[PDB]
Design a protein around this ligand. Structure first.
Ligand SMILES: [Mg+2]
Lengths: 140, 154, 101, 132, 101, 149, 198
């Protein structure tokens, strides 16, 4: 818009509670897809997004998996003639570190909502908490 | 020594989408989002604007008619969590017995003539009717002025 | 090697804590724990919902074809072959009036 | 000889599209996949249910837009959303498409209990990759 | 309409096995152990026999959901080899390609 | 001159030292109040302006999943607790305190505690079935020297 | 006599080179040749031919485009999303520092897939990992704790791993693993008469 611009855009209400926040030591995001290039674009989008919010991120590529199975080519007889098919799964692991629970929800929502079609995520949060109050003191 | 843990912020389920929406502005070279994004399907005039948004509503009403008339085909629910707004609607009373409870159903469904028939039948038998229930009948009749609620069908 | 009293009594204390079978149970009697810890084959969604509701698809698409909102090229193909076959006098006989009496 | 998904040679007068020209062994090499869901990825469930839903969605769109489809539809599932992207010939009037979009979306959202949106790109006529 | 009468019979077998899954579990549990008297186990051996034959879950056969083919089916898609090839060779299955190596 | 908020007022009413004394839902929403609210919504009812506003509306209606994804959204098993699923021996009080029936039911309740596909109500129903089964078979058990209930 | 409708010229022609592209593609959408002002071509070219054009291109439609996610948009998006984030405590600047004050590690997994159902059976499982050094255990207690847990204890790392998936929900499985730790800890300190016969 050249001359017509919003004046005071409405922004969502974020209210700070009195409950303490979760502390995630680690948060592993294993995305899976049949296409490597899609993971590269998502890897770029996710790493850029993490860096813009202050999150610490590392990336590695777990080894790909290929599943192959054989079928019978003819509708009837002709056993020796087969057709083989395969499915390829490719992985990109985004290992985040030292995240509070508010930072991990907003980031995961933002990147989960923008997950391309054909891509599956496997988040593995690792929370750190104190010891149970009973365990802290031995009681007979 | 004791670490100070930050107080967790909380927000509504739509808060994140609302934040992303605030960033984007109107596209000056595009028609309203309701209209289909295609040169062949973009409304040239103001008539085609209204006519395109009346054929779209017409198809929506044609689909809801099929769903609400053959509900047995649209009853399998495979959505977890369950989506109430994507289930067939039922507006005809399913309580057959003539009781104050049955009258309350008709009042809830907003049928005006059927509720009057069952209310009169309740009076014919003489069964007690709660003043609150009798008021829910008057509310429906007074608001709709004794006429069945407006609706469109074949 | 054999399990001494300390070894056996610790195993029972562990099983008691971890909610495992605490007594000495034969392999045969351990199937009762498996039967009641695993969903039966007939209760798994793959088994009872193996098929799509073919009645819903065939009925729904037939209803839509009669409302003019769906076109079945296959059915129109069959509808005209019956029309032509009936003209030729090869149409379906009425029930109870077949060639054999 | 292999007969699967091959548009065989005529005498140079058959107009095949890009999708039709390429045989199965070019899948993932020269031409992509018409449907994109997460159900065939490793350690993922509901492949049977996604595949059946696609078969129906393809037959439904053909009948709902009879003779108006220039090429096979492209199905995109993201979260619970389904997206149908079809190249459609400019045969029908514009308002008729608005009706068929409203109808086909509402009907398919109440049948599979998911949000379904229809994206239509109109072409003047079928695009011919090569004459075979 | 289902594909054929064989698919219909199987569908009913799948719906009656779901109804009798709990029953056949509880009764069969009384027999798969060595802790209960053999007199009770012999009697549960007869209650399980008395249930309808279609309640038995070993009479279910996995058939192609679209052609009702008894053998050659792939359990992940519930389609026969012939039907699966038609969809795969056309790019209609998401991520399935030919295996060249 | 024509000051909007400077000048004489009607003065029929007085300053509301007491405000909203009667509650808004004095009675359950009537048809009149339910219908006026629907009309107020139409006053501000404008069409979607982008994919964000459409997804926002779908979320408010439950059509679209909430994010971040929670695979147990709306899946609360009767507000139970871990101890209810795991400790099921309270229900075996009716059964013999010792003997073969106790040994068998211990195996039954051990499996039920390890069953994540059943609710507490469904687990109890398995226990009740055996209670009634052995009661019917009181005579066969007595021959074997087992006394039930 | 019949009138065939004429398509308008593509709106890319009206798009300036200094436009606000984020506004053009706010969210994930399919490739629209009339909205993307780029001469993109895709397709294996025929002999003495060029790759096919964007208009009527099924291959470009089959691609999951990132036009909605551009470096300019992402930076404008994350700028709004900063108010949501909370600050990690500065004191916990190292992994060892975290173990000092927060010895208990709870692993929970989420899964994102495409379909009508959001349900995954694997989401209920929970895994608790604590180091025995963090626990206050006497020489007797540590030996008893290590025998009861069996293979859950790893001598090399001195970490006890309790994995609980028996309960249906994740909040139950999590509460159960915390319970298992309390009983194992308290039981280890308790001394039974039969223990003197070791
Ligand atoms: Mg068999």
């Amino acid at each position: 818009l050249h001359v017509d611009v919003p004046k005071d855009v409405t922004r969502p209400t974020i209210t700070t509670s009195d409950e303490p926040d979760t502390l995630y030591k680690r948060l592993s995001i294993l995305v899976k897809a049949h296409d490597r290039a899609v993971l590269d674009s998502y890897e770029y989008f996710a790493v850029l997004a993490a860096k813009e919010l202050g999150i610490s991120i590392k990336v590695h590529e777990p080894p790909r998996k290929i599943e192959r199975f054989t079928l019978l080519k003819s509708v009837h007889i002709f056993k020796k003639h087969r057709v083989q098919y395969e499915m390829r799964t490719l992985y990109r692991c985004l290992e985040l570190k030292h995240l509070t629970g508010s930072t991990a929800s907003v980031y995961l929502e933002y990147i989960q909502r923008n997950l391309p079609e054909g891509v599956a995520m496997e988040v593995t949060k690792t929370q750190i908490q104190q010891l149970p109050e009973h365990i802290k003191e031995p009681m007979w | 020594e004791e670490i100070v843990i930050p107080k967790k912020k909380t927000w509504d389920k739509v808060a994140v989408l609302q934040a992303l929406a605030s960033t984007v502005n109107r596209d000056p070279t595009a028609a309203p989002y309701v209209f289909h994004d295609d040169p062949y399907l973009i409304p040239t005039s103001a008539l085609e604007s209204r006519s395109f948004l009346l054929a779209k509503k017409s198809g929506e009403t044609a689909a809801k008619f099929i769903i609400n008339s053959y509900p047995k085909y649209f009853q399998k629910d495979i959505a977890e969590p369950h989506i109430p707004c994507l289930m067939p609607e039922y507006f005809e009373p399913q309580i057959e017995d003539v009781s104050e409870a049955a009258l309350e159903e008709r009042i809830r469904l907003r049928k005006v003539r059927a509720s009057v028939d069952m209310f009169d039948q309740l009076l014919q038998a003489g069964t007690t009717v709660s003043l609150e229930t009798t008021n829910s009948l008057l509310d429906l009749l007074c608001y709709y002025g004794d006429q069945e609620p407006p609706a469109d069908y074949p | 090697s054999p399990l001494s009293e300390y070894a056996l009594r610790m195993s029972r204390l562990s099983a008691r804590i971890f909610g495992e079978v605490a007594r000495s149970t034969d392999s045969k009697s351990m199937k009762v724990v498996s039967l009641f810890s695993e969903q039966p084959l007939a209760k798994k969604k793959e088994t009872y919902d193996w098929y799509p509701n073919h009645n819903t698809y065939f009925a729904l698409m037939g209803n839509l074809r009669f409302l003019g909102l769906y076109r079945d090229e296959h059915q129109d193909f069959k509808d005209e072959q019956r029309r032509l076959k009936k003209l030729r006098g090869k149409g379906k006989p009425r029930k109870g009036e077949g060639k054999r009496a | 000889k292999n007969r699967a998904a091959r548009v065989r040679v005529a005498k140079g007068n058959k107009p095949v599209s890009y999708e039709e020209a390429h045989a199965p062994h070019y899948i993932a090499h020269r031409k992509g996949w018409l449907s994109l869901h997460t159900g065939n990825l490793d350690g993922e469930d509901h492949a049977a249910e996604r595949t059946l839903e696609d078969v129906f969605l393809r037959k439904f769109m053909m009948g709902t837009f009879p003779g108006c489809l220039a090429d096979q539809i492209v199905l995109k599932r993201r979260a619970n959303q389904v997206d149908i992207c079809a190249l459609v010939l400019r045969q029908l009037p514009a308002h008729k498409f608005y009706f068929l979009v409203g109808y086909s979306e509402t009907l398919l959202s109440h049948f599979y209990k998911c949000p379904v949106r229809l994206h239509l790109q109109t072409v003047p006529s079928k695009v011919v990759y090569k004459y075979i | 309409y289902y594909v054929d009468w064989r698919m219909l019979r199987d569908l009913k077998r799948r719906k009656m096995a779901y109804e009798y899954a709990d029953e056949r579990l509880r009764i069969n549990s009384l027999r798969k152990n060595t802790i209960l008297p053999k007199d009770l186990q012999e009697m549960a051996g007869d209650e399980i026999a008395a249930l309808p034959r279609d309640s038995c879950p070993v009479r279910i056969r996995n058939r192609c959901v679209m052609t009702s083919r008894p053998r050659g089916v792939k359990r992940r898609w519930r389609l026969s080899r012939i039907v699966f090839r038609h969809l795969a060779d056309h790019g209609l299955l998401s991520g399935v390609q030919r295996a060249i190596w | 001159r024509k000051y909007l908020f400077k000048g004489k007022r009607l003065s029929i009413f007085a300053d509301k030292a007491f405000a909203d004394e009667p509650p808004e839902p004095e009675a359950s929403p009537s048809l009149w109040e339910i219908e006026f609210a629907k009309q107020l919504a139409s006053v501000a009812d404008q069409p979607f302006e982008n994919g964000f506003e459409e997804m926002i509306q779908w979320t408010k209606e439950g059509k679209l999943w909430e994010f971040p994804v929670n695979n147990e959204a709306g899946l609360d098993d009767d507000g139970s607790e871990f101890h209810e699923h795991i400790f099921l021996d309270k229900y075996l009080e009716d059964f013999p305190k010792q003997g073969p029936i106790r040994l068998f039911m211990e195996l039954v309740t051990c499996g039920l505690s390890k069953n994540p596909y059943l609710s507490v109500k469904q687990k109890v129903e398995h226990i009740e079935w055996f209670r009634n089964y052995f009661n019917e078979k009181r005579d066969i058990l007595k021959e074997n020297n087992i006394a039930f209930t | 006599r019949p009138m065939r409708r004429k398509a308008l010229p593509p709106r890319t022609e009206k798009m300036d080179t200094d436009q606000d592209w984020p506004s053009v593609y706010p969210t994930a959408a399919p490739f629209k040749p009339s909205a993307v002002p780029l001469p993109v071509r895709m397709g294996y070219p025929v002999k003495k031919g060029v790759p096919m054009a964007k208009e009527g291109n099924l291959e470009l439609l089959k691609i999951p485009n990132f036009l909605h996610l551009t470096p300019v948009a992402i930076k404008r998006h994350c700028a709004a999303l900063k108010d949501f984030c909370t600050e990690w405590p500065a004191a916990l600047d190292s992994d060892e520092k975290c173990e000092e004050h927060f010895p208990v590690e709870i692993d929970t997994a989420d899964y994102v897939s495409s379909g009508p159902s959001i349900r995954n059976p694997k989401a209920r499982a929970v895994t608790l990992r604590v180091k025995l050094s963090s626990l206050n255990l006497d020489n007797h207690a540590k030996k008893k704790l290590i025998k009861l847990v069996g293979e859950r204890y790893c001598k090399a790392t001195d970490v006890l791993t309790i994995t609980t998936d028996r309960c249906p929900l994740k909040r139950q499985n999590y509460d159960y693993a915390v319970y298992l730790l309390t009983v194992l800890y308290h039981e280890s300190w308790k001394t039974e008469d039969w223990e003197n016969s070791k």
